[PDB]
Amino acid sequence: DRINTVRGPITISEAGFTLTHEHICGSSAGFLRAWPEFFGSRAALVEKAVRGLRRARAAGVRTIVDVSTFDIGRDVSLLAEVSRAADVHIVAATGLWEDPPLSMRLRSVEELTQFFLREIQYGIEDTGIRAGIIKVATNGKATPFQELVLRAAARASLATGVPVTTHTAASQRDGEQQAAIFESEGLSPSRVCIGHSDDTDDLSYLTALAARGYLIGLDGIPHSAIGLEDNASASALLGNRSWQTRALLIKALIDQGYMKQILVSNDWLFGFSSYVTNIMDVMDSVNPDGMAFIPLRVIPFLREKGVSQETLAGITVTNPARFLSPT
Amino acid sequence: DRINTVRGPITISEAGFTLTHEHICGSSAGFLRAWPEFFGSRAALVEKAVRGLRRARAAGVRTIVDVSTFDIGRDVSLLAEVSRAADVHIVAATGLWEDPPLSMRLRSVEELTQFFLREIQYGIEDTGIRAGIIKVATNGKATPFQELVLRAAARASLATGVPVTTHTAASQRDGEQQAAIFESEGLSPSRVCIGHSDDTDDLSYLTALAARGYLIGLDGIPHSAIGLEDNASASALLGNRSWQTRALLIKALIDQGYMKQILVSNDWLFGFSSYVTNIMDVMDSVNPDGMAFIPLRVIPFLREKGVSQETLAGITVTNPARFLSPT
Ligand SMILES: *[C@H]1CC[C@](C)(CC)CC1
Ligand SMILES: *[C@H]1CC[C@](C)(CC)CC1
Ligand SMILES: [Zn+2]
Ligand SMILES: [Zn+2]
Ligand SMILES: [Zn+2]
Ligand SMILES: [Zn+2]
């Protein structure tokens, strides 16, 4: 009956309009602490995040799910500060992404389960802030360690009811192996969002996942390097498909009967140290609306394409609440 | 005229008997903060380190150089606590080892130089504690990023006078490429210790480095899996050469005229999360003396083999002071 946020438990009705895959800062463990000048300063990063979340709140957003893990450099004290100043709920994540250090990569499935359970059930570091989601990742066929991470995420979710959300290389159909591993541990697909699924146009892949009961994360809608001229690093990161092409996948899944299984987000950030220098400036030039892009641009676009206000409210309010509520 | 420690500047004469390659904890960035239970508890790790350093101090040690970097999970607040409780000076390190995260691996040589200079000239995180050595690493041919790290370490040392110490795969003669890169930046070999050099018996490699002026780090003397039965992970980490075989390299370099260029250490730790679970228990069974192994076992061994007290005092007191004193 309660979702954990960086400011404590909230009721399901308090979540409201929820972006289910976002980041305050995409970094690495300990990096903001050791090298804040990379972001100008910690205070500058806080100010940029607060301004952005305030603009998102003005556009209707009430909650974001920050799916930054330990190895994305999640700083829940930073999240708590930004959430208080902007009056936007923030759900924090446990799990591991694609850059775990040796001290994680050498661990067993049982050890990883203990760590994920620590952050869900006890707290993150010494903050008492508890994670409300488990984030995992593959980029193609799972490494042996990533198989353990997926299994540990399933075990932590089975013990707590907290959902799992994934990073995929969608064009490699990673979600199929992720699903197989999750189901081998007994995890219900209704507890799992297969993310970055808007990175592919393969409807046979997307509907294969949705038919089994998975939630489908169409979470990078504004990610596009169309127009960026001669920027190889931005094109490799953002792709050459338009935001409209990504957004139309929302309509496609609605038209196939999966409106209750769609989760939509921007996968935006306010600082970004785990990629090339100045990528944040490039991304901000692509999408000045930042996290407000979903309510300000995507929802009107889909309404114009014939999607009802009621269905879009179900996707942005009802589905995230059903997903995040521990079950 | 001063060496920076985790408790502030000390005079050269205060350093005394110095172990030049040690670790309080071999971990990963943020790991002790996020998962202290891996070590039992933070307090248990502190207590184990204080007991060990007190036993080292009783055996004659006055200073250790903790060559844990950012990506070894260096916690200078932990080092400061242990150094105060044990009355042993601890010199902290900057640099990067073999497990840098994406936020480091994507950086330029200029950016890395800024980061190393930050930790030497300003402070580590928000602690005001300044590093007194720069640690770098290769395992075979340098990766492109490791080339940048070596160059940035050279630049930081050229600006500050602080020395550089390296991790090598000694049997692959890494020190030769490390030397080439350092010298291409104008760094004096007298500011560089090529470490893990006791991992090889190749005198042609060791003397090639010493002839150019490098300091030679014979820093893992008690590392041996001889006697360990059927432990593949311990054998891969520690090797099958005896501690006596490693220690006799000290005598070999003395006999070749390099007594002033030898640095000796244990490469010991009190916690170790970046390898297999329970490796610390295995290592402690191999060498119950821990960091006291050099004064309690190696120095008497070399005296029995004909090395003078005066030469061993030069190696353990004079050489570390000459190396660490900024120049
Ligand atoms: C909201 C109304 C229901 C549809 C039209 C699907 C029938 C989607 C938009
Ligand atoms: C101390 C005295 C000098 C030697 C014998 C090298 C001549 C080493 C031991
Ligand atoms: Zn991702
Ligand atoms: Zn993301
Ligand atoms: Zn090493
Ligand atoms: Zn070491």
Residue numbers in the entry:
A (entry chain A), B (entry chain A): 35 to 361
What's the paper's own text on this?
The crystals of tagged C23 (C23_2, C23_3, C23_4 and C23_5) and C23M (C23M_1 and C23M_2) grew from AS and glycerol, with one monomer in space group P43212, such that the canonical dimer is generated by crystallographic symmetry. Since the second C atom would not make contact with any other amino-acid residue, it is likely to be disordered. In the case of the C23_4 structure co-crystallized with O-ethyl-O-(N,N-diisopropylaminoethyl) methylphosphonate, the electron density is consistent with its hydrolysis product, O-ethyl methylphosphonic acid. The presence of a bound disordered moiety of detached N,N-diisopropylaminoethanol cannot be excluded. Electron density corresponding to O-ethyl methylphosphonate, the less expected hydrolysis product of O-ethyl-O-(N,N-diisopropylaminoethyl) methylphosphonate, was observed in the active site of the C23 structure, implying rapid hydrolysis of this ligand in aqueous solutions. Thus, based on visualization of the projections of different product ligands, in C23_2, C23_4 and C23_5 the following residues accommodate the P–O–ethyl and P–O–isopropyl moieties following detachment of the leaving group: His57, Gly60, Ile106, Trp131, Asp301, Leu303, Phe306 and Ser308. The CH3 group of the CH3P moiety in these OP ligands is projected into a space defined by His230, His257, Leu271, Asp301 and Phe306, an observation consistent with the previous report using the nonhydrolysable ligand O,O-diisopropyl methylphosphonate. The short distance between the P—O O atom of the acid products and the buried α-Zn2+ in the C23_2, C23_4 and C23_5 structures, together with the similar short distances of the P—O O atoms observed for O,O-diethylphosphoric acid and O-ethyl-4-methylbenzylphosphonic acid, suggests the involvement of both Zn2+ ions in catalysis.
